[PDB]
Structure formats: structure tokens, C-alpha cells
A paper describes a structure:
Mammals conserve multiple mammalian [name]-family proteins (mATG8s) consisting of [name] (GABA type A receptor-associated protein) and MAP1LC3/LC3 (microtubule associated protein 1 light chain 3) subfamilies that tightly bind to autophagic membranes in a membrane-anchored form. These proteins are crucial for selective autophagy and recruit proteins bearing LC3-interacting region ([name]) motifs. Many mATG8-interacting proteins contain canonical [name] motifs that have a basic hydrophobic [name] motif with a core consensus sequence of (W/F/Y)-X-X-(L/I/V), which binds to the W- and L-sites conserved in mATG8 proteins using the amino acids W/F/Y and L/I/V, respectively.
GFP fused to the [name] motif of [name] ([name][TP]) bound to all membrane-anchored mATG8 proteins. The crystal structure of the [name](TP)-mATG8 complex has not been reported previously. We failed to crystallize the [name](TP) mutants bound to mATG8 proteins but succeeded in crystallizing and determining the structure of the wild-type (WT) [name](TP)-[name] fusion protein at a resolution of 1.75 Å. The conformation of [name](TP) was unique compared to that of canonical LIRs, where W35 and I38 bound to the W-site and L-site, respectively, in a canonical manner; the region N-terminal to the core [name] sequence (residues 28–33) formed an intramolecular β-sheet with the core [name] sequence (left). An intramolecular but distinct β-sheet was also observed for the RavZ [name], with the region C-terminal to the core [name] sequence forming a β-sheet with the core [name] sequence. Although the [name](TP) peptide used for crystallization possesses six acidic residues, only one residue (E29) forms an electrostatic interaction with [name] (R67), suggesting that the binding affinity is largely dependent on the core [name] motif. (A, C) Crystal structure of SpHfl1 [name]-GABARAPL2 fusion (A) and [name](TP)-[name] fusion (C), both models of which were prepared by combining [name] and GABARAPL2 from one fusion molecule and [name] from another fusion molecule that interacts with each other in the crystal. Meanwhile, the W to T mutation within the core region of [name](TP), referred to as [name](TP[T]), which makes this [name] motif atypical, induced selective binding to membrane-anchored LC3C. We noticed that the α2 helix of the LC3 family, whose C terminus contained K32 and F33, was located closer to the [name]-binding pocket than that of [name] subfamily proteins (left), a feature that seemed to enable K32 and F33 of LC3C to interact with D33 and I37 of [name](TP[T]).
Numbering used by the authors: 1 to 131
The structure:
């Protein structure tokens, strides 16, 4: 459920819409996120999860470390291929419940949308409204 974490004198409220967040306590996630960012300042750590209601393939692995210059379009290609999605079937990414432009880079998305644990969370679905 909704979580509250204190960082730098702020009480951070997180609606916790992520299986990964539910299974990994905030302190552990932020500690790992800090470590990955320090070790690889040029890479973007992404947690990729299927929207619950989406009737398409699930991912076997959620954790991707991608170059900052990888485009959203290239990441679509990778995810689509990994879940064996036919070309006739739609796939949408959501970051903070908004579909990012295919032309955006993963570094841009990280800078605009990374969470208080230093991970970027992307959900995906077969439909353009998240659910």
C-alpha cells in the first residue's frame, strides 16, 4: 500500500504501484539505486513491469541497465522482442502514467521521471490507458 519514507528532511509519499516496490523495502532499493548510479553515471537503471490488466506476455526479468542515449523506440523493440509480441499487437510504455514520446531517450526519461530510489519505473501494456 501507500508508503512513506523520509529522505533529507522530506516525507516522501509513494503510491506504490509496483510489484517490485512491494517486494523490496525502500531502504534497500535506494541503496542499490545509489550504488548503480555511482558505478555507472552514464547508464539508466530501469524497472520494467507489465500493467496488471494487460493480456500480453510478461517479462522474465525486470531490471535493465541501458545507455542514456538509447531511445524509447529502441527499448520498445527490445521489450517487444523479449515477450514475443507479434507486430500486429500494440505495446505502450508508461512513465508516471504518461506515454513517453518514441523519440525520447532513456537518459531524458530518467532525468524527468526517476523515483526517489534512483530507479526509473516503466510499465507496459497492450492498451494506451494504464490498467
Amino acid at each position: 500500500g501507500p508508503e512513506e519514507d523520509e529522505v533529507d528532511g522530506w516525507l516522501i509519499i509513494d503510491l506504490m504501484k509496483s510489484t517490485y516496490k512491494e517486494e523490496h523495502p525502500f531502504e534497500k532499493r535506494r541503496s542499490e539505486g545509489e550504488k548503480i548510479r555511482k558505478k555507472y553515471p552514464d547508464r539508466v537503471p530501469v524497472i520494467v513491469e507489465k500493467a496488471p490488466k494487460a493480456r500480453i506476455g510478461d517479462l522474465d526479468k525486470k531490471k535493465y541497465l541501458v545507455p542514456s542515449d538509447l531511445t524509447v523506440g529502441q527499448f520498445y523493440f527490445l521489450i517487444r522482442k523479449r515477450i514475443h509480441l507479434r507486430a500486429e499487437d500494440a505495446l505502450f510504455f508508461f512513465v508516471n502514467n504518461v506515454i513517453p514520446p518514441t523519440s525520447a531517450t532513456m537518459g531524458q526519461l530518467y532525468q524527468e521521471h526517476h523515483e526517489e530510489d534512483f530507479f526509473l519505473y516503466i510499465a507496459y501494456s497492450d492498451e494506451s490507458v494504464y490498467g
